[PDB]
Write a protein that binds this ligand. Structure first.
Ligand SMILES: O=C(O)CNC(=O)C(=O)O
Ligand SMILES: [Mg+2]
Ligand code: NI
Ligand SMILES: [Zn+2]
Length: 331
């Protein structure tokens, strides 16, 4: 079995290898990359996502989210308070202000220490989940707005024809902005490209051990657990590496820098934080190996998780028994 310790693997495709996206995913899995839940892909040196970023300040963040924490430093939840719209130029200036900027630090490890010590005492503002793309239309390789769609994968593998579309999302981060422990909708893959700015640190639990993380989360967040049988779908809970280590939960960590891709694999729980002002682009995708994960994915029916139009069809076709109850949640 390849990669039996479930380490995060890093890949350096050549420009030739960068032509066929699906093929390269299947290659990485041949090497065991999925066992980690997360892989890093460093693009060939000849590749570029776009010529410059010189004109991105005019993008609008219609609903910036202030991430307010509750709990203790290593075990907390965050709620998203909606703020007034602002442009990327306004948000970048805010990120760089004395109130919100990255503190002085020695290296990534020192910064990670300061994040876990101090996160809860601040409320950074995240421009998350903005439909759009920063890939140039002329970028033909690994252009996250030109991927094969999940609907088309389900049609090719299973023959069924469904409504729905699959588009990318932009994320504008600042110091301490946080993504809570989650898997993707329907336990899909994700791919995330860090277009510019400061790094993003990731934590990940191997898919084969995801239920260990779920059981810990039920113990640490016991009222949330009674409220919903899949409350990590709410994307609000944080658990630190120290707490994970104390409770024996297998995990890995890695820092993504500008110009790098990350892939999350089906049922790979992940969480993390941004080091400073940055912009990432991410999208979900599927392969044939996903289908079985899609069929088994948990679902939030309490009503909190409230997701996309396109997830309806996935539930309806892969999980017809759950369909009814999950749609009561969504309506
Ligand atoms: O970048 C972020 O804030 C969160 N991204 C993801 O969870 C992902 O790409 O799957
Ligand atoms: Mg602009
Ligand atoms: Ni994700
Ligand atoms: Zn729920």
């Amino acid at each position: 079995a390849q990669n039996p310790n479930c380490n995060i693997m890093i890949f350096h495709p050549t420009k030739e290898e960068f032509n066929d996206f699906d093929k390269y995913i299947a290659y990485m899995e041949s090497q065991g990359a999925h066992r980690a839940g997360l892989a890093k892909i460093i693009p060939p040196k000849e590749w570029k996502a776009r010529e410059t970023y010189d004109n991105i300040s005019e993008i609008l963040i219609a609903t910036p989210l202030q991430q307010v924490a509750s709990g203790r430093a290593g075990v907390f939840t965050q709620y998203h308070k909606k703020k007034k719209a602002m442009t990327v130029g306004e948000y970048r200036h805010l990120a760089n202000s004395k109130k919100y900027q990255t503190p002085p630090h020695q290296n990534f490890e020192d910064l990670e220490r300061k994040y876990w010590k101090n996160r809860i005492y601040n409320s950074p503002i995240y421009g998350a989940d903005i439909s759009g793309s920063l890939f140039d239309e002329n970028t033909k390789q690994w252009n996250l707005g030109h991927l094969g769609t999940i609907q088309d994968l389900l049609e090719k593998e299973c023959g069924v024809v469904i409504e729905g579309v699959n588009t990318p999302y932009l994320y504008f981060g600042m110091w301490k902005t946080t993504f809570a422990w989650h898997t993707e909708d329907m336990d899909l893959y994700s791919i995330n490209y860090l277009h510019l700015g400061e790094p993003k640190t990731w934590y990940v639990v191997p898919p084969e051990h995801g239920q260990r993380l779920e059981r810990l989360a039920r113990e640490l967040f016991p009222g949330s657990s009674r409220g919903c049988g899949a409350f990590l779908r709410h994307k609000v809970a944080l658990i630190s590496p120290t707490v994970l280590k104390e409770n024996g939960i297998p995990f890995n960590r890695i820092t993504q820098e500008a110009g790098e891709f990350m892939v999350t694999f089906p049922y790979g729980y992940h969480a993390g934080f941004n080091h400073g002002f940055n912009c990432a682009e991410a999208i979900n995708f599927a392969t044939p190996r996903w289908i079985d994960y899609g069929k088994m994915a948990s679902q939030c029916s309490c009503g909190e998780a409230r997701v996309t139009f396109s997830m309806d069809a996935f539930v309806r076709i892969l999980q017809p028994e759950r369909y009814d109850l999950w749609k009561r949640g969504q309506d």
